Amino acid sequence: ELEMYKSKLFIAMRDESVPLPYINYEHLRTRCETFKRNQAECEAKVADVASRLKIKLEHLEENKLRPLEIPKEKEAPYTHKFLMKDAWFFAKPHDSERAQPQQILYDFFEAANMGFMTTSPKPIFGKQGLMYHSLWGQTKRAIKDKRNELEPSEQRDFLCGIGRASKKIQEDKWQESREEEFKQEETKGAAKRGFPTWFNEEWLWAMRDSKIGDWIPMAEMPPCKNEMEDYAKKMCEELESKIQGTNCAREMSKLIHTIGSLHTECRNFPGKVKIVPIYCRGTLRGESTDCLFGIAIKGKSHLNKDDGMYTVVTFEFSTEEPNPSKHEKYTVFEAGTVPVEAKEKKLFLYCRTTGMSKLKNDWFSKCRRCLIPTMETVEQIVLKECALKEENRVSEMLENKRAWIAHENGENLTRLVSTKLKDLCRMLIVTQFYYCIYNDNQLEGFCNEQKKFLMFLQADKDSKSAFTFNQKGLYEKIEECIVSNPLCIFLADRLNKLFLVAKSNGAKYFE
Amino acid sequence: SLLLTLAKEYANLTKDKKSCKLLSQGTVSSYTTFKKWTTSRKEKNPSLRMRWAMGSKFPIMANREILEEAGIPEQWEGIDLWSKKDLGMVLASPAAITYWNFCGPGVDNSSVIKDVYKAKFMKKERWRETLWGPMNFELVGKQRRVVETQPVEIKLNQKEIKELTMWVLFEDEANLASKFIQENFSLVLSLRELYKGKAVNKDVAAFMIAHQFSPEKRFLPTFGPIRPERMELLHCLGGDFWKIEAVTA
């Protein structure tokens, strides 16, 4: 029972892996069974203290919390897959029988007149004009014949990649040649950009109310007892009355319908290029209507693994003049004229080739789950308030309480805009939506390090005299993950402006 | 007459050549590691493959001879319910599930269903007959305890329950005789007068016995009184910043 199998190779293996002042495991076991400590331990400890050269860094005397180094280079372009602020939609009443996306596409082919959708073969700017012209004409006569399958021509054989793949040769035959096909490997990394200036107008536009009403497909309310449930119900209803009308709701409905449709087309038909509309659904004057924002084209996705990055060709509808700084990756054509009643303004068609993935389809398509973290946060605020006053003051607290946001541009020192608390969730849902779009490695590392600086600012608010051991390597770690993400550079700039506003009262920062 | 059927099955499976090297070569416990041969890695996206499954036309594996007894090949307007592609098992659509749920035959089995799930209908009966009141809006919080959370009247400790289901259902290979038997063997005399003649399967019977005898003790944050009856009311009575309780009875 108390006998382990004493083998031959293991007893030669255990005696080989002993520390260096020991010969065998027997001598080490007899020394460890007969061990008594001494007071030469403190001599080695202080002998480790003396050869250290390490000092702590205070903040009340050497407040070197400098602002971060935003790169002074070329401006980061607009890299979202669709258009947020420059969108234009055609509307029609929704038919219940005609509900599949191809039937919506056909009913908008007779509804939105594509016969007036004439494009010149010379674009305003971009890279490739003739391929997008022949591709747009081919998909326009493809929708005209009421079938969504592009016949193989050189335009689709050039845009969605067919045959553009390397020949993966295994190491069984290589047929070596003297100084011919000299092969090796090389990596580069990521390119660095600068501060985007277009992000403020899309933030302030994204939380602005749009008259089309409900956008997001929520569900019904369960029945309520005489419990706290009414309270929860009340909160939901009030928060719902803020988030159904905003433009972030329109973008979320756009990603859900459009990307869900592309997702089902990626399951049902690999190896065949389909034509998928880019649309929404919302209530206009009570009438349930659907919109149409663009035309998307699949790229014969054979999704073997969770990756794969298939090619989507996007034709978008816009009614504003383009910009070679913001709209850098587009291939802006001109489409025509649209009568807009308050006279008949222009119409610009945009073009962009891009890619999706199978792992970024479930997190984009199922992005209706951004109302947990905003409702989660707001209810944390209200429950802290009623936890601090011990009285049912919630309905008057959501009206008589301010929240400081949105300092102006010319000045920042103590010039802040206090809003109502029920409006605040608007801004909150905006940032959660952006956390789904611009999620990279850089946003993750930047959010860890900004949690560190939030801990430093909380140490500043209560005068606790915090300290740090190494400030050089800290800023060598934060500035490493600020390269090309627009949200990371933007939130770094707003972290610096948070340090500028907080510098006027607490003293741990710079100008 | 079941032993002749088991003799035909056991004589049937020893006819195979390479299967004789499987049995009588392993151990009795190896049946456990004969149960799991899941060659898939993790099934890392279940809802994703489920939404990809429900998007097709015929995702479901359904039996043929039961559905052809009463079902119809196609519905009143083009709704497909049947296939002829393949054991004799036929693929089908969930419109046949809702069509079975609205235009199918019915067998009265309310007593069996209302006797298997007595613990959960006891939870509904205890939930419907309570009364609440106003909230408090105060700071609350307490450490984590190990609480039995079910209003049982027997209170066994997860050791006489497996042994109890051995010495009630099938006693031919139950257990070595311990000293925990005697009064629980009077309880065996009570239980064999109940589970003798039923249409309930022995796995469903062993399921439904273990939910009336086992107080589920978990490691949960509790506060106030530690009565078990308000332990399914744990998440409803109070959180971290709020508390609501006015239960009289």
Place this chain on the structure above:
Amino acid sequence: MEINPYLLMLNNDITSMISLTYPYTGAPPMSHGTSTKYSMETVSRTYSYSRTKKEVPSGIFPIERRKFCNTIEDKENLEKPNGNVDINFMLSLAEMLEEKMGKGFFKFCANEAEAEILKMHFSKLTEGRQTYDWTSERNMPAATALQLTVDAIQETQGTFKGTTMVEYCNKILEMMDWPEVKFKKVTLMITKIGREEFIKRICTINTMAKDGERGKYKRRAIATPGMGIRPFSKIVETLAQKICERLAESGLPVEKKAKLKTTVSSTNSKLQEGQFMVNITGDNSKWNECQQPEAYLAMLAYITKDSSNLMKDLCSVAPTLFCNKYVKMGQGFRAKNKRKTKEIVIPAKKMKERKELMNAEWRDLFETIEPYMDGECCFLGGGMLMGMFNMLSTVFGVMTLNYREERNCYWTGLQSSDDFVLFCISRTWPEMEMTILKFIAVCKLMGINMSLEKSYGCLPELFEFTSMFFSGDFVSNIALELPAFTTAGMNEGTDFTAAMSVIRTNMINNGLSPGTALMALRICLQEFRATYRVHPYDSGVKNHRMKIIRKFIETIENKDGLLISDGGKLMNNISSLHIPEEILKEDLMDPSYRNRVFNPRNPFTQFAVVSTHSFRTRSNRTLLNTDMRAMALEEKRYQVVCNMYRSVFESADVNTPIGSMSMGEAIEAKILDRARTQFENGIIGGEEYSEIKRLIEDAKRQRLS
């Protein structure tokens, strides 16, 4: 007008405005391509931290061996992390540790551990994560790799009759003595392998890339061991599990909130007239490259000094398997021409021959790892990778936090896997520099490197421990994963109730305020409805399943008793998250509807909630066209034999079927036993008993031949 979302923190705390700074909502980062450079960085970074060149030649392995203990070359850069442990220093900390609580501490904890070793069956090894199967050299679940290991034992020499932990471990140590091991390759041929290659194969640990880790810019390689290391690691994790459960300055098993209240409340009552306390949040960097298993061999040689003779040699094997472990180096790299047209694949085997086709960083990492390379693997002897001893290094943290130097200035705190919170009590600030540099001194001597970039401190409680930012009075919660709400995906009945179970368990453990629960419940309701194409009857949805429901709604009398999966409304709430939908709705259903849905004669379910919508989706199509079709035949045969053993023992899934003779012999003796018991009080007929007896005897002669 500019806009700043951070300004709420001007008049709030970090306990409410901290869930705003988590990007736990978007897509996680995945890895792409090979994971060879991460393994080269981990192994070469491990050898760079060894601080020595003392190499010892080996007689078993054909590669050199570098020592990691008591061989230091003291560089001037001591702030750089070291990987060298002084064994007399840490044994002095162990003797100083056991003199704090009790006298027979290690004897009591070791007798509890050995009290739980001898009552353990090895099927607990099948209740684990993925392991490395060396038969086909892949990543498999634990039952499949264990079954291929036992298949190699019963195929090589004799059979297996162990059914315990200790006899299976002695079976593996018996396999180390075998001169030749025979197994099966792929169409199931039988191959053989020698003795030293079996030693090279039993200690092989597979490395891959960690997918889905929120919070890093650079990726990291995670490691999965084989099967012959896992039960010994289970032994060591039970011993260190009982040690961590017995101690009072650790937080691994979990309450993690009461202990900090007792040490902040208790150590603030130990102050003099001029002393004060400063707490420091730290974060130990390079934790998986500075914990050598030789110190585990020394301390695990010290704990079991008076335990037994079986435990004294049984808790001194997994460090010896960790002192000589191999590392799978991924699958190589790829090369291409100047035109970027043809791209050859170079595996990890021929990386030595194709050495001159690499980059600058690949050759810099490869020339520092070259005298330790095997053909496919690498020889690591001082690392402790992820997926290994976790409850044992926390004991080293408690050994650092219980140092006694003899003023009255000292420290305490709390330890986790790589997160410590340290409370310092002293009188002046240069004395604070003395005590903190003594803490970095004792951690630096013992082998624990604090990161100087991710550490800070304050005077009151404003510290950080396992992503719960504790302020002066309030407590922030763990930002939970949003994908865990919908991960069932198996049935029209086990999705909504499973999601209500996830909302309940996230409500009890975490905070999860009620409006968040109702919002997440309603969103998971909408994703259920959109997933299974079932909408309410008053809606205007017209698909292939709502035409039947809209057509046949006139037969149903009570309309709010229909299920959610059949076009009903919502009746569950926050106060009904423990009651399923069917059991809540059966008090209002029509009798034709309730007798129609719950009919067990259904073509879908026939062949924890009520099984009435339980269908099985169809299988794939490429599972019977590849070269692994015969493995699906093998699991078919396994399910046939398991259906036979289920058909013999009518109650077998309730109790664990222990036994060590055979399966078919208990079948035959069982049919004879119930044939006699049901014979004498029962049957009575000559042709039936003689026919069953004839089939048992003919099946026994067929099985024996």
Place this chain on the structure above:
RNA sequence: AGCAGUAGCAAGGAG
């Protein structure tokens, strides 16, 4: 081209 970031995908085979 494009997605993407420390390396892959963007059908396969033959010359």
Place this chain on the structure above:
RNA sequence: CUCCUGCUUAUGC
């Protein structure tokens, strides 16, 4: 650069 090869009907309170 040149030449040969494919089925999967998708409906947001």
